[PDB]
Design a protein around this ligand. Structure first.
Ligand SMILES: [Zn+2]
Length: 170
């Protein structure tokens, strides 16, 4: 499995971080809790999900009881396989999991992240400070379907896309 910010397989599997990998932890480029996630994924690549070989791990975001993985699917990876891996990650880490394909589309990210809550549509708002906001519309009747507080999901989407994202119920 490829890595946006690579760590050695030996260091990840052992948890004994070499000087390079420890430096990534020390500086904050990678969080220590991510090593555990990568180790699970590498262990799964060996026998359960070889399609991970040319997938990419980008980063993980963890607020409250939700872990979000940002990935690129290899040429044999499928959304259903990611769901299976998400379930394993849920069990081992005792936390909800959403796996997001890295994409330029805020809408496609929001659809994946909020599932099974429906995205009714997305709006663009130009704000007086010269910024541009994207508003994800969801249904009031589907709050129980969101995997975390709408506000946690907004901040996560804002980080992922480095641009302000809001979720608004209607
Ligand atoms: Zn290392």
């Amino acid at each position: 499995m490829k890595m946006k910010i690579p760590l050695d397989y030996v260091c990840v599997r052992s948890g004994l971080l070499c000087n390079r990998c420890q430096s990534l932890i020390d500086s904050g480029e990678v969080f220590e809790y991510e090593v555990e996630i990568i180790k699970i994924l590498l262990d799964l690549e060996e026998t359960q999900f070889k399609e991970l070989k040319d997938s990419t791990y980008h980063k993980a975001y963890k607020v409250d009881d939700l872990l979000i993985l940002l990935v690129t699917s290899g040429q044999e990876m499928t959304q259903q396989k990611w769901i299976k891996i998400a379930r394993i990650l849920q069990e081992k880490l005792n936390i909800k999991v959403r796996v997001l394909e890295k994409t330029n589309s805020i809408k496609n990210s929001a659809v994946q992240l909020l599932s099974p809550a429906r995205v009714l549509g997305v709006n663009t708002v130009w704000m007086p400070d010269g910024s541009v906001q994207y508003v994800i519309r969801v249904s009031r009747s589907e709050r129980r379907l969101l995997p975390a507080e709408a506000q946690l999901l907004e901040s996560a989407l804002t980080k992922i896309h480095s641009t302000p994202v809001r979720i608004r119920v209607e």
